[PDB]
């Protein structure tokens, strides 16, 4: 079935965010089977779900990007029917669909800010190409459902999308992400 937008996170001085639900469980299941989603889209970050899992998608330069381990090869439910992936890069764990019209695109970009599923903004320190550390460690449960979420620079430009957390005893210390560069490498 399709990936279905079930909510959104709208981003803002310092970086703030809030979440808004747009779909319920049943409408999620049905929209997944039809691929037809007639709802208005808003914001830079979409909350997305299949019938078995949910996660995040980030709009960067007119492409709505997420993790392959969340979305697999699936279409995104859209106003004219299902939307085929424009990019499908399995080795990078990256996929993208053309961004639906109303979505707000971020533009590409070392103190970074991770935006979680609950619309908390948490400081991250870049530690190389595709890894960052959490400046204030939190339980990994606090990051549940945030895969595909954006890593921002202080001006709110996009640095990458969040992929996995490195954990010790249930505490997340580091985040693994897909760099905005890998989106550019993918795009050509």
């Amino acid at each position: 079935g399709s990936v279905v937008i079930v909510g959104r996170i709208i981003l803002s001085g310092p970086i703030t965010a809030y979440s808004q639900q747009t779909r319920g469980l049943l409408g999620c299941i049905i929209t997944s089977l039809t691929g037809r989603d007639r709802n208005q889209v808003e914001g830079e970050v979409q909350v997305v779900s299949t019938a078995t899992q949910s996660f995040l998608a980030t709009c960067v330069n007119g492409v709505c990007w997420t993790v392959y381990h969340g979305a697999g090869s699936k279409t995104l439910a859209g106003p004219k029917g299902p939307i085929t992936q424009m990019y499908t890069n399995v080795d990078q764990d990256l996929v993208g669909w053309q961004a639906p019209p109303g979505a707000r695109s971020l533009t590409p970009c070392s103190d970074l800010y991770l935006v979680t599923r609950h619309a908390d903004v948490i400081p991250v320190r870049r530690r190389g190409d595709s890894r960052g550390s959490l400046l204030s460690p939190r339980p990994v449960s606090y990051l549940k459902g945030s895969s595909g979420g954006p890593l921002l620079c202080p001006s709110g430009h996009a640095v990458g999308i969040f992929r996995a957390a490195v954990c010790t005893r249930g505490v997340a210390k580091a985040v693994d992400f897909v760099p905005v560069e890998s989106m550019e490498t993918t795009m050509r």
Partner: peptide, 17 residues
């Protein structure tokens, strides 16, 4: 250490027991 993927259950607010 442990490398964790961060998918949740289906829907906007996934149900837990």
């Amino acid at each position: 250490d442990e490398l964790v993927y961060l998918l949740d259950g289906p829907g906007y607010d996934p149900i837990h027991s």
